[PDB]
Ligand binder design. Structure first.
Ligand code: GC9
Length: 522
């Protein structure tokens, strides 16, 4: 007989999307003629009232040289890059064979599809209602598949007990006339307001130098809805150079918890033609030679933003090629000191990560010594009072480098977890510390997020540690995005019980997801 192979997806279901890939079906029809229907059963706890529709699409066949490669689709069904074409399945790739609006817990999708004498691809689409809850979870099973009016044998290659989580596409390719959005940062203000910052890359997805601003999405309802985009940092035709030679990017955001003043730091590149700032910034101090470290602050819960504050003169050694913040977020230590992770290419052209701190509420800043050589992007958290843990992208590859300091970066101690506990593909990673009194578990925890792999940027994962970063137990992890993406992410606590994550996913340039703390630590 012919067997219908089923692969359930593990990717965010965007609430605003008209389509979301839920299942993929492959059928090599050696003895099959017609695929009549597919029967689907949603889980007992699923709220069907939040589901707008369920659809069955046919996507044709496969190239004969690709038979036996165990592919479940011939092409990407829903684009995350085509401006204005990221909300619905591409009609040229997928034929809508059936649709059920306002479905019941048991859904029958009739297809009546004449099968190609060979490989046939189908997939199931799930469309949520615009008002769907961020925390409700969707589970479903394929109960039966009818082929030639008889029950077809099924073999499911994906695992059981998959939990599909929804998310909000805070930024899609093309929004507000910008080709792409990258490099997320995410914080929660003292008033519970969510602030997410990112590169707005108008012309394309290339790094600096280019036409880039720092955009900000503000949410006052826990990430359900986001306010119109703001631009805390934009330099336009500064110095009478074109905007594409005045980009600002790689933002990092922090909240001064003592005052609720919000700070955003970024790297403004001036000149440099159309080349990458990583090898186009040079020693010196002024805009005409080296990238400038600029700040903007908000004293009204992120609604309005000040003019840029250039602190390059305070902290940059003139012999460095490039000084910039570590993208993502900063912190406020228990004693009130503000800390931003930073990275600089030194006089030998080697990058090193470290921290930059202010004891006077952000008026003056300081850098002492690097934590480790040949490291770049890093995130910092106060694991225990007075002890700063820096988690660093390591160009040696394969795993994160972790170090700690007790004197604000004058001296560093290599952590036991360094270069062993947390694998990476040399990407950016998020690290936050949540203190016992500020979370529902009444335990000090560390939350870490990154592509859980050594090659490629996929399987974006949040990991939790209860012993200050010594151990990251497998049962304390949630895999949110199996698809391929740009890999950058940033974490925050929405509330004492829920984590928020803003990251570059396979379904949207800026994707927001909410994960219950008890979901990770059960
Ligand atoms: O060029 C700059 C400096 O502004 N930043 C890049 C960064 C590199 O700096 C990398 O960390 C060193 O190779 O890479 C990525 C990325 O998504 O992989 C994004 C940043 O935009």
């Amino acid at each position: 007989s012919d067997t219908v192979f089923v692969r359930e997806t593990q990717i965010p279901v965007l609430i605003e999307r008209q389509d979301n890939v839920l299942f993929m079906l492959r059928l090599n029809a050696k003895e099959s003629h017609t695929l009549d229907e597919v029967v689907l059963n949603f889980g007992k706890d699923v709220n069907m009232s939040d589901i707008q529709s369920v659809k069955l699409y046919y996507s044709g066949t496969e190239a004969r040289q690709n038979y036996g490669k165990n592919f479940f689709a011939p092409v990407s069904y829903i684009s995350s890059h085509t401006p204005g074409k990221t909300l619905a399945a591409n009609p040229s790739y997928s034929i809508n064979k059936s649709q059920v609006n306002n479905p019941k817990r048991k859904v029958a999708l009739k297809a009546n599809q004449k099968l190609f004498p060979g490989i046939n691809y189908f997939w199931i689409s799930l469309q949520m209602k615009p008002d769907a809850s961020l925390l409700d979870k969707v589970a479903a099973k394929i109960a039966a598949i009818k082929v030639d009016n008889k029950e077809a044998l099924m073999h499911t290659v994906s695992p059981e007990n998959i939990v599909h989580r929804v998310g909000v596409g805070v930024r899609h390719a093309g929004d507000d006339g910008s080709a792409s959005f990258r490099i997320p940062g995410l914080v929660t203000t003292n008033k519970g307001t969510l602030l997410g910052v990112y590169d707005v890359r108008y012309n394309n997805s290339a790094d600096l130098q280019e036409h880039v601003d720092i955009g900000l999405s503000r949410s006052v309802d826990g990430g359900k809805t986001w306010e119109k985009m703001r631009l805390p940092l934009a330099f336009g035709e500064t110095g009478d150079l074109p905007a594409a030679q005045n980009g600002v990017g790689d933002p990092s955001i922090l909240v001064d918890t003592k005052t609720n003043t919000v700070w955003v730091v970024a790297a403004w590149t001036h000149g440099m033609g159309n080349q990458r700032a990583w090898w186009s910034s040079y020693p010196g101090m002024d805009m005409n030679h080296t990238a400038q470290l600029v700040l903007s602050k908000s004293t009204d819960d992120g609604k309005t933003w000040s003019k840029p504050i250039n602190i390059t003169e305070q902290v940059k050694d003139p012999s460095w090629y490039f000084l910039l913040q570590g993208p993502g977020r900063g912190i406020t230590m228990q004693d009130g000191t503000l800390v931003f992770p930073i990275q600089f290419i030194d006089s030998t052209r080697v990058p090193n990560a470290g921290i930059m701190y202010s004891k006077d509420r952000g008026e003056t800043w300081k850098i002492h010594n690097y934590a480790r050589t040949n490291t770049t992007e890093a995130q910092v958290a106060e694991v225990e009072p007075g002890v700063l843990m820096l988690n660093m992208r390591d160009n040696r590859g394969g795993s994160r480098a972790i170090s700690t300091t007790k004197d604000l970066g004058k001296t560093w101690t290599e952590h036991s977890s360094s270069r062993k506990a947390l694998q990476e593909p040399v990407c950016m990673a998020s690290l936050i510390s949540v203190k016992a009194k500020d979370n529902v578990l009444n335990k000090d925890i560390l939350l870490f997020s990154n592509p859980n792999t050594v090659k490629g940027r996929h399987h974006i994962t949040i990991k939790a540690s209860l012993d200050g970063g010594v151990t990251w137990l497998p049962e304390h992890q949630v895999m949110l995005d199996e698809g391929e993406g740009w890999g950058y992410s940033c974490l925050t606590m929405i509330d004492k019980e829920t984590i928020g994550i803003l990251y570059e996913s396979s379904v949207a340039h800026m994707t927001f997801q909410a994960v219950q703390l008890r979901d990770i630590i059960k």
